[PDB]
Amino acid sequence: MVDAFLGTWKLVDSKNFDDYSKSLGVGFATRQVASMTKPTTIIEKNGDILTLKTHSTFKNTEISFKLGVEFDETTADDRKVKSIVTLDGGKLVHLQKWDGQETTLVRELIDGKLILTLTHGTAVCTRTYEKEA
Numbered sequence: 001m002v003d004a005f006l007g008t009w010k011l012v013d014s015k016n017f018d019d020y021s022k023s024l025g026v027g028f029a030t031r032q033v034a035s036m037t038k039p040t041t042i043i044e045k046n047g048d049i050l051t052l053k054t055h056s057t058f059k060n061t062e063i064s065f066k067l068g069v070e071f072d073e074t075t076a077d078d079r080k081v082k083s084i085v086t087l088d089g090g091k092l093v094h095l096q097k098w099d100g101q102e103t104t105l106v107r108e109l110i111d112g113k114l115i116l117t118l119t120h121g122t123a124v125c126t127r128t129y130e131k132e133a
């Protein structure tokens, strides 16, 4: 059941995003702009296919995928990764693999807010999104 994740979401809090992006090898200037950017994430479904848009004044991305089926992805920071998204414990878990590395993007609804936890290396970033009507 992915349905409570669907809709338009706006970033309202961020913790440790610089640590996360730095761990991925993102350069200082991009990290600087990212620290002041508040994306909008739009999650939509059509049958078995989810589409996840991330929009901002800096970078935009869009992916479409079926839960549990690997897909190719080119991330906002230009990594070419092998990805899979599943539901696990009611959380939407996105795993990216490239060059033997991994990162996870885990989304979980808590009190109506969408909490995105990003882990790479030892870095753990928590970002909070609120629903927009």
Ligand SMILES: CCCCCCCCCCCCCCCC(=O)O
Residues within 6 Å of the ligand: 011, 021, 026, 030, 034, 037, 039, 041, 054, 055, 056, 058, 059, 060, 061, 075, 076, 077, 116, 127
């Ligand atoms: C959409 C603006 C992002 C700007 C950051 C660019 C370099 C870091 C990108 C890291 C991977 C994507 C992180 C997504 C974060 C999110 O959806 O809130």
